């Protein structure tokens, strides 16, 4: 039973002996075997008393579980409930990850489940490597470990061992002729993972055992990966390989100098200038066979600086912080290319720093460039548009002015991203559709914020018609959230999530200007929620009528004269007057309610339960339907 399962789980949590013996004996020995072979949802997480004894580290409970009872070690569970949130574990995984050598020792001894394949086909050797303790890995290798497995992330145990801060496991793996040249999911050979967090000893060990230098899926050598992450030590080690070439040496030095310019943990502008100058002097040293820089055409986002192909201009921009920052951005874009994953984040950081210094024009420029790069790479920018809505709120709450082409570009990108978010939601049925739907709703909210700023600025005729074109393009896609709210239900809803950051001030919902903009940009005013409420059943439920009359009045005016049918019944068969938790909303609606005999006759047909099917016009069947 579930109650006795919880009882024995609690007994195993404290690691007791007599309580576990009494609670797992005599009474229904078949059910006792079932309980020791059962997994339950405790604390919202799937776990087993045996696997939690392997987790808690209490010895005697697991000794008497594996000795006084014949319990299998193949019981299901969760490999990690923080950062991984995936099930399918075994006792070996939780024993190794927690860090108990003796527990996993007598767990493998009482049943060798070393080749355990979960839902993500990851063996407990991953837990052994992630724990970092050498003894568990030593024993699991002594149990004839098959070191060839790739996870759902397609990473060998060597890759995760090198990515973590543990080098003893890496040394033990390479000491028995492991695979330091084998490829991971994209391109990683554990060098791209050792040269990501700054583990110089792991890189040294892999280089000593000939891990080789090969580009990854993004064309990034481990030297270039280390240079990208501001790892000066790893770049120093990898620049001495007996085959590095001048072009790669100077591009790694330039990338390191550029990376030092725009970063948070490692932000040094003196190191930026010095590494850029060191790579410049290395270019211009011989005169004969002089190495010349492949200067890209100027980019409007980084001011108008066309790189620095001479030491004179580089020395000129030595003392200029902004020039050095944009030079680092240009060098990163040139070396990495405008398609890398890591080429966009420094641009966003420089934009954020500029925004924090009340500098907004080049902030918008840099963030728009990063947004364009991430859209061309087809990546989730539901946070970048939120950052745009927050900075646009900052440019409005501080009484500044916002350029209309900026809002137009952000709105076009938001419309696009909502379109591919709909594509992602509809393409993936149920595999991870929850996060995709949440991103979709967040992106709709960011669009509504952007429309809210668009209503609170001044625009020319061409800019205003472009903005209205983007709003029309979105509103004709019928964007519905998970509860059914169209893009206008949210604009009239009090319970619309506004971000707690700077959008909480400028962007207030319900909005009388956003609603009118959506209405005259072609929004279906008679749109229906999944609950059944129309766009009017929501505004007349507004709980701040007298305080916010101007918003409440102008929305109800806008909807009714924009075509709202002020008699619709939701799936609970309630008119907007019936679903009006406010006397003022009732007064306003009754002022705007235009009576018709079709509405009264449909109300009498619905209320009297008259069978109208196949006795009325087909177009009128819907009319009786929403009455």
């Amino acid at each position: 039973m579930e109650g006795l399962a919880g009882y024995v789980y609690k007994a195993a949590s404290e690691g007791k002996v007599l309580t576990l013996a009494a609670l797992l004996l005599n009474r229904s020995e078949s059910d006792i075997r079932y309980l020791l072979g059962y997994v339950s949802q405790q604390g919202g997480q799937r776990s087993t008393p045996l696997i939690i004894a392997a987790r808690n580290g209490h010895a005697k409970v697991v000794r008497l579980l594996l000795e006084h009872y014949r319990v299998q070690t193949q019981q299901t569970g969760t490999v990690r409930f923080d950062g991984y949130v995936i099930d399918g574990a075994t006792a070996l995984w939780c024993a190794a990850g927690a860090g108990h050598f003796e527990v996993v020792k007598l767990l493998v001894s009482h049943g060798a489940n070393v080749n355990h394949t979960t839902v993500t086909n990851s063996t407990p050797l991953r837990a052994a490597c992630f724990d970092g303790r050498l003894d568990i890995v030593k024993y699991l290798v002594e149990n004839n470990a098959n070191i060839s497995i790739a996870n759902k992330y397609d990473n060998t145990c060597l890759m995760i061992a090198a990515y973590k801060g543990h080098t003893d496991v890496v040394r033990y793996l390479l000491e028995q002729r492991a695979d330091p040249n084998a490829k991971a999911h994209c391109g990683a050979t554990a060098l791209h993972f050792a040269a990501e967090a700054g583990h110089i000893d792991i890189v040294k060990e892999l280089i000593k055992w000939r891990a080789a230098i090969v580009v990854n899926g993004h064309g990034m050598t481990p030297l270039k990966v280390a240079a990208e992450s501001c790892k000066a030590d790893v770049v120093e080690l990898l620049l001495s390989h007996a085959d590095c070439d001048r072009r790669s040496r100077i591009e790694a030095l330039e990338l390191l100098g550029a990376s030092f310019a725009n970063d948070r943990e490692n932000y040094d502008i003196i190191k930026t200038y010095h590494y850029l100058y060191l790579a410049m002097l290395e270019r211009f040293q011989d005169g004969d066979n002089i190495l010349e820089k492949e200067v890209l055409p100027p980019i409007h986002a980084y001011g108008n600086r066309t790189e620095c192909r001479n030491p004179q201009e580089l020395e000129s921009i030595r003392q200029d912080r902004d020039a050095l920052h944009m030079e680092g951005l240009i060098v990163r874009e040139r070396i990495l290319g405008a398609d890398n994953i890591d080429v966009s984040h420094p641009i966003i950081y420089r934009g954020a720093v500029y925004a924090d210094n009340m500098e907004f024009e080049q902030c918008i420029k840099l963030w728009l460039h990063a947004l364009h790069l991430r859209q061309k790479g087809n990546r989730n920018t539901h946070k970048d548009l939120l950052r745009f809505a927050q900075v646009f709120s900052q440019m409005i709450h501080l009484n500044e002015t916002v350029k209309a082409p900026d809002i137009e570009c952000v709105l076009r990108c938001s419309v696009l991203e909502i379109e591919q978010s709909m594509n992602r939601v509809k393409n993936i049925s149920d595999a991870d559709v929850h996060n995709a739907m949440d991103n979709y709703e967040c992106n709709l909210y960011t669009f509504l914020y952007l429309v809210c700023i668009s209503t609170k600025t001044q625009c020319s005729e061409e800019d205003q018609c472009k903005i209205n074109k983007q709003i029309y393009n979105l509103i004709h896609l019928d964007p519905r959230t998970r509860e059914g709210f169209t893009l206008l239900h949210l604009a009239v809803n009090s319970n619309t999530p506004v971000d707690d950051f700077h959008t909480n001030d400028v962007c207030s919902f319900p909005n009388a200007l956003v609603t009118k903009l959506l209405l005259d940009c072609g929004a279906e005013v008679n749109a229906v929620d999944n609950e059944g409420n129309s766009a009017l059943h929501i505004i007349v439920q507004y709980n701040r009528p007298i305080s916010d009359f101007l918003t409440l009045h102008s929305i109800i005016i806008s909807l009714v004269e924009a075509g709202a049918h002020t008699d619709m019944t939701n799936k609970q068969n309630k008119t907007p007057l019936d679903k009006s938790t406010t006397g003022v909303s009732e007064i306003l609606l009754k002022t705007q309610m235009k009576m018709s005999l079709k509405c009264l006759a449909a109300r009498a047909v619905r209320a009297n339960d008259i069978n109208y099917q196949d006795q009325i016009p087909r177009t009128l069947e819907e009319f009786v339907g929403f009455h």
Partner: peptide
């Protein structure tokens, strides 16, 4: 501050 919210994705 804007630069603080970037640490969520890093």
């Amino acid at each position: 501050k804007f630069a603080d919210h970037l640490h969520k994705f890093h």
